[PDB]
Amino acid sequence: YNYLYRLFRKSNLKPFERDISTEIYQAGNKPCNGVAGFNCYFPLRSYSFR
Amino acid sequence: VYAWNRKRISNCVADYSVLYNLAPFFTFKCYGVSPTKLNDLCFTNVYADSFVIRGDEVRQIAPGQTGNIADYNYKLPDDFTGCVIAWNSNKLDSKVSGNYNYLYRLFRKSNLKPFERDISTEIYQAGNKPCNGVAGFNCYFPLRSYSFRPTYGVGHQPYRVVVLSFELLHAPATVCGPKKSTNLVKNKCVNFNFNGLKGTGVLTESNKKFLPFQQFGRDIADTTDAVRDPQTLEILDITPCSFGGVSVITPGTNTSNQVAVLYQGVNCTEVNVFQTR
């Protein structure tokens, strides 16, 4: 829970662009707010450190 | 389980978006590049496997796991760059008194190697005795019988699992994902990407006759001048966007500040007005 990893993002990343966005991921064709939908998950993958 | 099929598809268009409008697939864990950015990615050799397991055993299909079906029935290497698809199939694969139409191997000497299908069924072996395998207690049948009854909750219900083995090896690809086809904008300088060929220009209607196999077109100066529309077979014409040089006519700063503008290479349309040669 100390070190983490961010998943894919809708917009691209320019040089020195601090991505601190943790909201829903581009709901679009289906309301993804709250309940996750297809191709829409929370952009935060917790890494495992054995 | 032990006779998992393999119907390899090649040289076809694979639109994975069709699987989203199907039955709820709450197992789409793409252990690969990207589950979202998947349609815009061509593949070379895609191997589609299929098998039916229980509910609490779907977590063993991931690359690297222990258990019984991930070590002696169907084991995946720790290099699988693809997706796993599973869904509850208890609506049609669960009957009264148990569905005995799914057999899974239980007793196997060594661990199953990557991508091996054990279609043979030989009785297991034992110690200092040559059991042929009739009714021996010391020995046992390798395959077992699943009991898929609707009397079981989430975990013991059948789940049809289907994986796609994306090789992604460096070779001429055959399975390319589909791309959208926006409406044609004729007589308006825009960007075009007709079958990889990029560039900008004014797409119009041409009058030349191409050959049935000739797709693109060129000129005496090695420039794409005409390409046929991939959707509708019609000969178009590619003329670049209206450019040209600008030359300012100034009578001198010490005299005045009004200036005239000359747009060299235009017909007073692609911009008092006076058209010169």
Next chain:
Amino acid sequence: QVTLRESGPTLVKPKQTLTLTCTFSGFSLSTPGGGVGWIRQPPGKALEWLALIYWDDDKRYSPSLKSSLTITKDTSKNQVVLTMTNMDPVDTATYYCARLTAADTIFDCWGQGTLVTVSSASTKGPSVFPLAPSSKSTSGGTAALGCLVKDYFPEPVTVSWNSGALTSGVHTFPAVLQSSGLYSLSSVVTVPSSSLGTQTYICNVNHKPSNTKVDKRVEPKSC
């Protein structure tokens, strides 16, 4: 749509083997998850499952009755046949065959029902004698005429005055079991005294177990 009709002899000798069939039409039995079963409904009781077949020749039966219930499939002609032995005077009930589309939809579409009343008695000849709509029924409002079909043991028998037309009007009430161990129906039609003397009215008895269809009429009498 799905049409589940039954057939077979309703009346038979006791301690025999029934041959109640179920002709299905409108769907294919080879669909994954499909199947046709059999449900029993005793008079004045609840439903109870007896047997069920599937699309892979699997024959599931009730755990209580396994030595007599033998179901078979004839998809070549689309006719599911059920056979049961050791007929006792406790199995008299209206049988239904319903299609099991899937596990979630438990017997969505059902049949129509065929009562099998076999305890001791055989068939009996029905006596058809329509009741004449005399001045008593005429002056007493609607001159309701009804055929007096009686002296018959099998319960399932349909009647319809001037079959084809005049769907309404007929009462068609359940029969009464008297001390003779037989049934009797007196279904009258609600046709008023507007025009009934110059026409012809036949209730069209359909006592199929006896294989008899006596169509006859009556004339206004004088008491």
Next chain:
Amino acid sequence: ALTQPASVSGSPGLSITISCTATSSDVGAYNYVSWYQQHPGQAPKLMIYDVSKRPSGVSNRFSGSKSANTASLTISGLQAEDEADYYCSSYTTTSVVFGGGTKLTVLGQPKAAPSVTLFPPSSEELQANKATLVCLISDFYPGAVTVAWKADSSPVKAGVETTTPSKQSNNKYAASSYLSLTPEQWKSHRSYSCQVTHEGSTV
């Protein structure tokens, strides 16, 4: 097995619920449960399967749920054409149980009066000694009648009792009168008048 309430009453417009208890539930998780409807004289038709969903052709009045182990059928907006038996069915470990029955009695209807119809016997069965005069009455809401067949003498029935609900389209209980008229005593009987007594209005 599955136990169900025997008699359930409901006012027109309100909503009533059914109970499909466990009763030593060998069903396990009790995933799938379907409710049927069987009117008197017809075949049971499915109303709601997979209570989280409903089949096509069923109005929004029918709905179901299962909190922990008991399935309930919530029927809102009761009407006259709703008095039928319901059955909850699930998948057991070795069979398909159908449970018990549940009769719905929707009160709040005016008490109807039964019309007497004494059809005279035709002159075809009298020559064969089969006097079977009938006083078929119907169209009454309570359902408790007692015919008083008598030719100006002691009233007797002798087979009139039949217990026929006959829930037809008008939802009115019918009856069935059958006389044991002696073929030899038909001459002595003047007309054999028929009198029917109804509930409440005994006269």
